[PDB]
């Protein structure tokens, strides 16, 4: 027994390429399209719930996860790799930050943390890089709203808008046209739905579209009152019903 794989499974090839990073990226290109748009007063991330069977309960599977009350993530690539990355992300959000400074990490740092996790699976002994790419969106007091992308390589960059997976190229293009620096949240959500509609084959409704945003504070979702400095989470996932209402004015 004992993991005897104490050597890298990702190495440099003569051309200077890192095979596994590449192949993982490939695996990502096959994933269902997911995107993110940053407005002036919020951020929106959305993907498509590709029910692998009509018997499956689309709800029992979210692709949009809350990492901290002000940070949300979404992905394209291998779902299982995404799910464990989310657990690790939520935990490190506490262990390396909340349990030290008494506050949640700022988007860039948390992202930075996840990226570290991924970097390691790129160099540590006996493992393969994560087969996913994430789009994390959040808001902290000193940096405002932000949107980042994280790759299997461990590299991450901030975007105004972008898309990953299947029809990323087409989507990125459609986004460059509609995006400007004076967008309001609702405007972005709209642009989001439109861009997504292109990448959607079958049914396109609030039961096949998973969409969440980072915006105002939601006191109604806090769960308690009496602490003026605690106003609620900025992360809210839209409901099947809320999606449709905006599709009618599409």
């Amino acid at each position: 027994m004992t993991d005897r794989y104490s050597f890298s499974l990702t190495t440099f090839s003569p051309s200077g390429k890192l095979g596994q990073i590449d192949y993982a990226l490939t695996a990502v290109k096959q994933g269902v399209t997911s995107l993110g748009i940053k407005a002036t007063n919020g951020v929106v991330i959305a993907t498509e719930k590709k029910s692998s069977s009509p018997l499956a309960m689309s709800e029992t599977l979210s692709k949009v996860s809350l990492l901290t009350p002000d940070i949300g993530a979404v992905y394209s690539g291998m779902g299982p790799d995404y799910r464990v990355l989310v657990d690790k992300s939520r935990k490190v959000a506490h262990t390396s930050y909340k349990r030290i400074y008494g506050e949640y990490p700022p988007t860039k740092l948390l992202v930075s943390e996840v990226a570290k996790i991924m970097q390691e699976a790129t160099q540590s002994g006996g493992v393969r890089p994560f087969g996913v790419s994430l789009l994390i969106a959040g808001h902290d007091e000193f940096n405002g709203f932000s949107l980042y992308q994280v790759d299997p390589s461990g590299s991450y960059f901030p975007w105004k808008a972008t898309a990953i997976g299947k029809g990323s190229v087409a989507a990125k293009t459609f986004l460059e046209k509609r995006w400007n620096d004076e967008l309001e949240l609702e405007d972005a959500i709209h642009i989001a739905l439109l861009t997504l509609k292109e990448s959607v084959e079958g049914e396109f409704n609030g039961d096949t579209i998973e969409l969440a945003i980072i915006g105002d504070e939601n006191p109604d979702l806090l769960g308690y009152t009496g602490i003026p400095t605690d106003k609620g989470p900025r992360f809210r996932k839209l409901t099947s019903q809320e999606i449709n209402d905006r599709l009618e004015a599409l």
């Binding site: 490939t26 069977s53 018997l55 309960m57 299982p80 790799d81």
Partner: protein, 243 residues
Amino acid sequence: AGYDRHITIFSPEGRLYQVEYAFKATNQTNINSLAVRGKDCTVVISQKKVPDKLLDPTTVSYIFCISRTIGMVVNGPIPDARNAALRAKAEAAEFRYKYGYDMPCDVLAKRMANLSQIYTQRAYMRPLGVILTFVSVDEELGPSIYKTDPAGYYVGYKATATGPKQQEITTNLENHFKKSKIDHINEESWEKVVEFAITHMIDALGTEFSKNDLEVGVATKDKFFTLSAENIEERLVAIAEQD
């Protein structure tokens, strides 16, 4: 180079062959099973096939009792199935000790899925060639069916089927629900749900079953149990007078 097919690293197409072949192993038994949700119970039918005459029929099962409340059926080789069954029982016992309440069916599935996800990334661990269907009547969610595979993927179903003839059962069921317009058998007794289950299992496989060709498990509020040959027979006799 050709080793990217022996361990769980990526293929140039960004695929994991070992995971695929593991999915292959799940059918090695050539057994089909399905699960449906009652109004307040969950039922899982699975084929029981005993070739050798020298076998003790009572010991040939692929249905498991994980906890007083969670029941699990396995599609795949028996050794891996048992490995998965033990771990699951341990996990469910520990969860109780640590958190003070019975581990929820869906959580247990997630936990087991996460463990599989790992054999998918770490090179020294091979995936388990099995598909696990967990059922129970969760105290919060109600009748529940959650299944995981060697990919580390998992999800909840309104009903589901697994095995070589997975598609027929699935489409058979798919149909019935498009018609009934609801997401469950609108029956009160689990007995009729078990009967509905066995009926459709027959239409899809186009086969007749005796009291020893099946294996049945039932999950109800605060309990999961498996019917006996006679319990089954009583079921078979009931669906007789109707056809």
